[PDB]
Amino acid sequence: IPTVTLNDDNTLPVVGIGVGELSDSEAERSVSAALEAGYRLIDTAAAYGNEAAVGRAIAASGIPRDEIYVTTKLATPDQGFTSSQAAARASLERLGLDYVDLYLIHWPGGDTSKYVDSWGGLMKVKEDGIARSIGVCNFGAEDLETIVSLTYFTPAVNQIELHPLLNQAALREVNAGYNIVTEAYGPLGVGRLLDHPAVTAIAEAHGRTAAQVLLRWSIQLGNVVISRSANPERIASNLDVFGFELTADEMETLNGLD
Amino acid sequence: AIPTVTLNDDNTLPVVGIGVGELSDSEAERSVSAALEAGYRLIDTAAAYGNEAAVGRAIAASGIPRDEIYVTTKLATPDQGFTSSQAAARASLERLGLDYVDLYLIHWPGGDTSKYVDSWGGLMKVKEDGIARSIGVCNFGAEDLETIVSLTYFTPAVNQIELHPLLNQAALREVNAGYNIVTEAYGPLGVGRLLDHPAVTAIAEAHGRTAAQVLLRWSIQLGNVVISRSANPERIASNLDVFGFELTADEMETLNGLDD
């Protein structure tokens, strides 16, 4: 499956699975199903409380470590320069891993000093080999300008809620301007977009599912797209989004919903 | 006691409810059963979800009097139209195993304006016939609302939209209030991420409440009906316990400032 090349020369798959709001057993099952299906990009977070579960599914998968792309995140209670560096290490211990592929600040917050410090900490985390790449979630233009101007180190990724009713055109421009990759989560709009008349028309034109169209659109925007879990049958279906492309007109239609 | 909102048609709905979007029949039956046992009475389903029969099985199985339960379902987009929406409402009732629904909604306006205007006229008949106590819409913008109100003279009771502190819909809530339309929020946790937002966590700590409880309480204090995505029996019972505390004006202001 296709990759994007990050500004630090590392690569990520353009699709992954997220495990937010999953219990330990649900998380472990979901990751294990996704890996069997062909997913390699796994999105977790310390705040989810299920890193150990995800680590267990990874270890049992029998897939080589270097083919898996593990993302986790700094929990908000652990924000800060010194504390973030310890937090990343604590996540590794829970995951049973020697490194993660991508490590993210989960939220900037209104205290600029805290997220600036967190970013300086994550810079040390990358330097130390603890994370291959570093990035952020839900940073606006001003938040990005602040870390770039004060630290001189640009995030690899900015993770944001993105779907045709919230297409994030403005922020994608800002992201791309800094050579930051946009990572989309919530690609289905809380399930509602699966019945959107424009989505259904395009799905029917291609003989694909509504979810497939939603995902393919996001991929064609240049996004890395994270699907929530899921079920073995739907997981396999969602991954099957590289055998068709949406036309310019189809893109324009979906682009006009926001 | 779970408080209600009073709709423009004089009917009332509980201020909190559970949704079964993206659930299998098995999951929906389990989630609705759990929610009802925990004290939820407002249930949000849709024809497009394909789990109406499962939801209806759970409602029937509960033994709770029908008149204490508030069932919402929705017109699937393939069924839009004046004549077809009236048939669709009845097909939903048959799947739900019910004689009426409390709230019946157009799922999406769509680019075909004639289609949703006709759907709206059909739903007016559905309400006239007693098949739905109240009728409304999802994801209608100001132009969509002006189109249906100007052409049909009948105002929706509810406008259901995604709404959380990173997408607070202040503008659409103003549009809705101008028409005396109740805003119904879904995705109140922002795909789960808001559970770890520093401002939410500080306010949760101030109250000795969970982050989810603060997020739902905020939405309630905005005047919304708030639908929670289906969760575990432990979580859903916790999420329902949002009426023994109140966010201060400062706390509201903080959570209101997150979407900029």
What backbone torsions phi and psi does residue B181 show, to the nearest 5 degrees?
-100, 130
Buried b (16+ CB within 10 A) or exposed e, B160-188: bbbbbbbbbbeebbebbeeeebbbbbbbb
State how far residue B192 is from chain A, nearest Cα, in angstroms. 6
State how far residue B170 is from chain A, nearest Cα, in angstroms. 15
What would the two tokens of residue B16 be? 């909190």
- Residues of chain A in contact with residue B167, where contact means CB-CB under 8 angstroms, are 161, 166
CB contact at 8 A, B87 and B59: no
Work out whether strand A11-13 and strand A3-5 pair parallel, antiparallel, or are unpaired.
antiparallel
3-state secondary structure of B13: strand
Resolution of the coordinates, Å:
1.9
State how far residue B11 is from chain A, nearest Cα, in angstroms. 26
CB contact under 8 A, A196 and B46: no
| Of the candidates A199, A214, A167, the residue with the CA atom closest to the CA atom of residue B76 | A199
One-letter amino acid for residue A110 of the chain: G
Query: Can you list the pairs that B137-144 forms with residues at least 24 positions away whose Cβ atoms lie under 8 Å?
Result: B137/B105, B137/B106, B137/B109, B138/A192, B138/B74, B138/B105, B138/B106, B138/B107, B138/B108, B139/A165, B139/A192, B139/B107, B139/B108, B139/B109, B140/B106, B140/B109, B141/B109, B141/B172, B141/B175, B142/B172, B142/B175, B144/B109, B144/B116
Method: X-ray
What backbone torsions phi and psi does residue A4 show, to the nearest 5 degrees?
-115, 145
Q: How far apart are CA A150 and CA A144, in angstroms?
A: 10
Q: Is B218 exposed, middle or buried (0-12, 13-18, 19+ CB in 10 A)?
A: buried
Q: How far apart are CA B173 and CA B161, in angstroms?
A: 10
Write down the H helix ranges in chain B.
Answer: 25-38, 52-62, 82-96, 113-128, 142-152, 170-178, 198-207, 211-221, 233-239, 249-256
Size of interface A-B (CB pairs under 8 A): 93
CB contact under 8 A, A106 and B193: yes
* Maximum distance among all Cα pairs of chain B, rounded to whole angstroms: 53
3-state secondary structure of A240: coil
- Residues of chain B in contact with residue A190, where contact means CB-CB under 8 angstroms, are 21, 162, 186-187, 191, 229
Instruction: Name the CA dihedral angle for A32, A33, A35, A38, rounded to a multiple of 10 degrees.
Output: 170
CB contact under 8 A, B193 and A107: yes
Q: Which of A24, A48, A76, A139 to mutate to test the interface with B (most CBs of B within 10 A)?
A: A76
One-letter amino acid for residue A250 of the chain: E
- Residues of chain A in contact with residue B111, where contact means CB-CB under 8 angstroms, are 197-198
Residues of B annotated catalytic, as ranges: 49
CA distances from A79 to A16, A87, A88 (A): 26, 9, 11
DSSP B142: H
One-letter amino acid for residue B243 of the chain: F
CB contact under 8 A, B196 and A110: no
CB contact at 8 A, A213 and A238: no
Would the annotation count B226 as a binding residue? no
| Of the candidates A145, A209, A216, the residue with the CA atom closest to the CA atom of residue A175 | A145
Would the annotation count A226 as a binding residue? yes
CB contact under 8 A, B167 and A161: yes
DSSP B223: T
Domains of chain A and CATH, by start: 1-258 (3.20.20.100)
Chain A nearest-CA residue for B115: A197
CB contact under 8 A, A20 and B139: no
